[PDB]
Design a protein around this ligand. Structure first.
Ligand SMILES: CCCCCCCC/C=C\CCCCCC(=O)OC[C@H](O)CO
Ligand SMILES: CCCCCCCC/C=C\CCCCCC(=O)OC[C@H](O)CO
Lengths: 90, 116, 98
């Protein structure tokens, strides 16, 4: 459950930085989206494990698609922070 | 290509219709989202601010719908109590509350900055 | 990643990819650029979650159940709202750009 640490740290950094309201909303939203997509991904895999523990083509497919989503949200969070911090310190 | 969109649009309308017919809470939420999109559309704000007010509430809807999809799968498997059944719905509901709080705060921060 | 080799995801993925490349090249401010990019990436995220759910449903069986269709429809509706949000975002932001 160390994932909440990452989120708190981001909010602390965002508050610590001297940025406008819009920038701060984007920095924190992007982190919040990651959290949302991870929880939705964990729900899906909970359902997969509820159906059965044995392997199946569609169970793996479900988990692979869920994980890819989390990855996309993570990439989007990193791009956001990079772009905004580059602009703030430009 | 064109046939794939028409079919998916049909499924999408059945989905909005079912969620709407089935629950008062969903209807009232959809009311709240449409009021926010309208208010954001008429506010004298910059374009980026306008987008954030709209996106934050639309995200509420997206997560609401995705979570209702998972609830339907869990209820599809069985209405009987199960640990992963309860857990799936718990993680799903958390995701909905996060998005809703994030929208409320976003609206509070931006409208406070716009007004005074 | 056997799913990225399908025509459905490829057509949706390549569209999102182009929008991110266009956004990367546009002459706009930073917060505008972040918004253009993250809105089309949200389409991709939701579209992946929707296929995950569809996969779980098909996992259960080929027999039809009302909640099976409902799960798939609600997933499709989520994708639709995400797409609308992306179109709205690009419209509002690039209308001003002119
Ligand atoms: C495959 C992933 C990427 C590779 C791993 C990371 C490598 C980072 C190394 C050097 C930093 C170069 C300069 C970075 C700063 C930079 O680009 O500043 C311009 C402004 O961003 C324009 O606004
Ligand atoms: C996946 C490959 C990663 C490869 C590593 C680099 C990733 C840099 C992040 C975003 C690029 C967006 C476009 C960059 C230029 C850009 O946005 O400049 C204006 C800014 O707003 C600063 O003022």
């Amino acid at each position: 459950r160390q994932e909440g640490v990452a989120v708190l740290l981001c909010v602390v950094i965002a508050a610590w930085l001297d940025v406008d309201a819009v920038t701060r909303v984007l920095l924190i939203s992007s982190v919040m989206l990651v959290m949302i997509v991870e929880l939705l991904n964990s729900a899906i895999e909970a359902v997969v494990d509820r159906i059965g523990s044995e392997y199946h083509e569609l169970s793996g497919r479900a988990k692979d698609l869920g994980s890819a989503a989390v990855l996309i949200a993570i990439i989007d969070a990193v791009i956001t922070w990079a772009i905004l911090l580059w602009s703030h310190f430009g």
